[PDB]
Design a protein around this ligand. Structure first.
Ligand SMILES: CC(C)=CCSP(=O)(O)OP(=O)(O)O
Ligand SMILES: [Mg+2]
Ligand SMILES: [Mg+2]
Ligand SMILES: [Mg+2]
Ligand SMILES: [Mg+2]
Ligand SMILES: [Mg+2]
Ligand SMILES: [Mg+2]
Ligand SMILES: [Mg+2]
Ligand SMILES: [Mg+2]
Ligand SMILES: [Mg+2]
Ligand SMILES: [Mg+2]
Ligand SMILES: [Mg+2]
Ligand SMILES: [Mg+2]
Ligand SMILES: [Mg+2]
Ligand SMILES: [Mg+2]
Ligand SMILES: [Zn+2]
Ligand SMILES: [Zn+2]
Lengths: 402, 402
RNA sequence: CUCGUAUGGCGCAGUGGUAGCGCAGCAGAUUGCAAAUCUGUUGGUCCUUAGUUCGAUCCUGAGUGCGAG
RNA sequence: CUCGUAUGGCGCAGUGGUAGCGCAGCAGAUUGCAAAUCUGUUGGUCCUUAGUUCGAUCCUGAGUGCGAG
């Protein structure tokens, strides 16, 4: 049927560069899937692929959102799908490329449509949602459909809230809506994972951050700060839209010697991001797609042409030719990445909540662990231990008094 | 979503016995998928699972067809699906078990519906189909939609004919109908493959055949011969319906010392069938389902409980719990069976036809190889070689002639 | 002691100029027959020996084996 | 040669009773914020030694290493 190639991988592995090659070779168009690259201008830090390097290959869902609006999942689902539709009804083959692997879920119905299902929210319902208290909205969820409330920590406000918002707009238990999902991906899809040992990658990521300021990153940072300013924006705004990007908020303290620390801070966010990306691909993506993915070793750039270009084209050629791929699916060196142990095996299955009666966090609430495995980890943590000593020792102060 | 478990494997690995265990443990019903077990009575040779061993677990699409009719794919698709539907809308979980892995294709839309698409066949069209000549129907196909005619050898009458039958009833090139298929399987399916080293299996299959006659196989063979007889049936009828079963046609020459040979002949058909089954599962099934299947070593029956029962239950448990399976998917010992080399790698990709001008078969036609790889195999075969000698040697009796 | 045969795993062809097939085996195929069907293909040097002959697996003799006497 | 400072990977607190805060690191989560966000967590015995005292990282006195006229 209608083929669709998707290139995934950590930041700085050459996804875009590969996307182009495949686009030319197989007549296709790029469909960005980068939560930040969808914003107007701000190319250097948001690291967009320069036009003079796109070989004229069309790109969609990229650099079209104004800093005034906030992009998101469903905004990507409609935009991404339209592109797919279009590129298909033109004899071309779509190639979605981005580091926001989360959005990929749209490729296999992994979401809830609360839009088409309109429903006037009640004063009562709203008052609960937009409530000042944190644990109030949770207890509400725990009440109506506790099976979903047990999969979310009572502090995960964003999500716990989301779940409740669904229980209302759909009037259907979210836990049930999930047991009735398909997850089957539409369109014959070919997932390509361009990997690279962390050590080498990190080094490149650090230099790429350096020569990124040399190309005039600060000019963009200040511009961003201009709009940021004269708009009475607080640093706590850096959790919405473009303000989330890795390249602005890091220098905020500099924009009120010191600039260096804001750079090292950026080098850290990027490094962390890269690490989190692999985690998602190994614990979220792969498991979801039953593990139908092919790896591409991009650790030794001196190579690339052999390990990436060719291998990709090889797989892609058979894929597009509506034939079963004969490729090894994973080069010996990275063969372990697709193993169950490194993937589905790490996924949390125990959800029973536990509440420590002796430990409590800065927010005053008592510690709550999820899953017996981690519940024990806590019990044996120096945190819990130390807390259990002051407690015992205190209890004794009286025993001795008698 | 709606779960559906499928137990596959060669004949005599214990599929049915396992199907029951899983049925009980997980509240489900069996849906037979054995092209022969769907016929009335004739249990011993058709090897049906005895009632006193089904723990009351309901069975569908099994032993309901009269020897007068001929079962087939679409007959299975409607029957199988109805059972799935029903079993589901009752809180139960279906468990399709059978050795006719071919039918399984219904689990992932791998067929063409020429029924719902009625179309009065033309005298001209029919005269081509039901034509006495063999290569006439082929050349017709080669004309209208040669892309499909190039994937079938000009001697594969059954199929070449079928393809043409589709081009008519649907008025759509079959080659195109395939490039427009989905193949995506409906229902969240869990494929279990119960394997067993050939050597041990064969030994059991042989004894299985022996003690099969001891339980009164001949009684069924004669009964079958009764209906067969007084019906003026010729041995060439053993290509339709029940008459295909392995246990009847083998003794036909005995039914007109000798009975022994008819038994050894049966022991051979069974052995061969088992070999062919694995081939289908490794070159057809697995590749089609992108390799989402779990192996179960059933070579050492002394075990079974550990390697089969438990492992299956383990995987099944997580499956049904709508959770990502953490099981290894393949026990070290059989780990190689799921490798690409043993699977998709063996699939024929070269379809260009080749015709040897010096070699010809008993039917008078010239040899026709498919795929350069096999085209060469022929060119170097002693057949071709020997034929090229008589040719050359004869030509030399011409140069000398002048 | 009459006579007949003796060919790749089995069952068979054939030929005076160094051999074919069926089955098994191995392999490819499979979108209404699938426990069925189609396709390709690896195995011998024609029991041993001494002769006839330009040359024998196919002729003569003998031995060895097997078969109906 | 007289003063300072030496505490988990880096940076810095600190009470007489057997140690912290920040950066990182590690891990779990993710179905309208995901370059985001929530959650859990490993690390050192406080530069070595002799005293002092019931007790020392912190108190006294040496020795080691770095900074300063
Ligand atoms: C007699 C023949 C050729 C096939 C039927 S055996 P089976 O596949 O039904 O037996 P199991 O379920 O594997 O025990
Ligand atoms: Mg590169
Ligand atoms: Mg890029
Ligand atoms: Mg703007
Ligand atoms: Mg989404
Ligand atoms: Mg991390
Ligand atoms: Mg059975
Ligand atoms: Mg075979
Ligand atoms: Mg058993
Ligand atoms: Mg031959
Ligand atoms: Mg013989
Ligand atoms: Mg002579
Ligand atoms: Mg001789
Ligand atoms: Mg931290
Ligand atoms: Mg001391
Ligand atoms: Zn605690
Ligand atoms: Zn030839």
């Amino acid at each position: 049927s209608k083929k669709v190639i998707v290139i995934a991988g950590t930041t700085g592995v050459g996804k875009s560069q590969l996307s182009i090659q495949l686009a030319q070779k197989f007549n296709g168009e790029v469909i960005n899937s980068d939560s930040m690259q969808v914003y107007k201008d701000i190319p250097i830090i948001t690291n967009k692929h320069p036009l003079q390097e796109r070989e004229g290959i069309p790109h969609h869902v990229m650099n079209h959102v104004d800093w005034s609006e906030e992009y998101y999942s469903h905004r990507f689902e409609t935009e991404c799908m339209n592109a797919i539709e279009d590129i298909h009804r033109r004899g071309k083959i779509p190639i979605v490329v981005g580091g926001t692997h989360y959005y990929l879920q749209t490729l296999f119905n992994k979401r809830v449509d609360t839009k088409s299902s309109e429903r006037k929210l009640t004063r009562k319902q709203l008052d609960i949602l937009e409530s000042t208290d944190p644990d109030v909205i949770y207890n509400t969820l725990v009440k109506c459909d506790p099976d979903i409330a047990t999969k979310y920590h009572p502090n995960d406000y964003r999500r716990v809230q989301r779940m409740l918002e669904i229980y209302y707009k759909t009037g259907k238990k979210p836990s049930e809506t999930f047991n009735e999902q398909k997850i089957t991906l539409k369109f014959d899809t070919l997932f390509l994972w361009l990997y690279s040992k962390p050590e080498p990658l990190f080094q490149r990521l650090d230099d790429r951050v350096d020569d990124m300021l040399e190309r005039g990153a600060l000019q963009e940072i200040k511009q961003l700060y201009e709009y940021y300013s004269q708009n009475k924006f607080t640093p706590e705004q850096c959790e919405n839209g473009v303000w989330q990007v890795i390249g602005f908020k890091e220098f905020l303290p500099w924009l009120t010697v010191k600039l260096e620390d804001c750079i090292e801070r950026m080098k850290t966010r990027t490094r962390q991001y890269a690490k989190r990306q692999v985690k998602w691909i190994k614990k979220m993506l792969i498991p979801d797609i039953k593990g139908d993915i092919y790896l591409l070793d991009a650790t030794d750039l001196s190579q690339w042409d052999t390990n990436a270009s060719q291998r990709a084209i090889a797989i892609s050629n058979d894929f597009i030719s509506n034939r079963p791929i004969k490729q090894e699916r994973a080069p010996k060196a990275l063969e372990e990445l697709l193993s169950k142990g490194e993937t589905t095996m790490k996924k949390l299955d125990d959800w029973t909540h536990y509440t420590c009666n002796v430990c409590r966090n800065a927010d005053g609430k008592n510690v709550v662990a999820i899953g017996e495995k981690y519940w024990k980890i806590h019990l044996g943590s120096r945190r819990h231990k130390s807390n259990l000593k002051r407690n015992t020792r205190q209890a004794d102060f009286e025993k001795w008094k008698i």
